[PDB]
Amino acid sequence: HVPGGGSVQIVYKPVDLSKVTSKCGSLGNIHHKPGGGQVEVKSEKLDFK
């Protein structure tokens, strides 16, 4: 007679991470509009015919 059993195997799945996006707001915007254009407002026309 061969005496019974004496054999198991481990309940084991290794852990890892997939498709974890680096979605931080650290560079979250790029858009700009200038603070108006350059103009002259200080001078008269002096249009005395």
Add this chain to the structure above:
Amino acid sequence: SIQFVDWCPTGFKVGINYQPPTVVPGGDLAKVQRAVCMLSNTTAIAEAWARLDHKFDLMYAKRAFVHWYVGEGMEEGEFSEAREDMAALEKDYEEVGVDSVEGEGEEEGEEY
């Protein structure tokens, strides 16, 4: 020494009234007997306007405040005409400052 234009020695009109002045009381009263008042046309008024004129030049060149006036019934062309006539008036109080040239001793010569 009181400087006056050479071409108006008649420079005065005059008026003498018998009624003395009244003071409107509000202090101790002076015992007044006789008084003087005077109106004078002069070119010192040119010294006054010389700044008020450059102030209009500075304001108008910068277009400062002009949107209150315009909004409430005006156009920039009106600010120009007003200043233009005030530049004519600047030359008017200088023309009454001219020490005028002599006219004596100018002739045609004789026809033959």
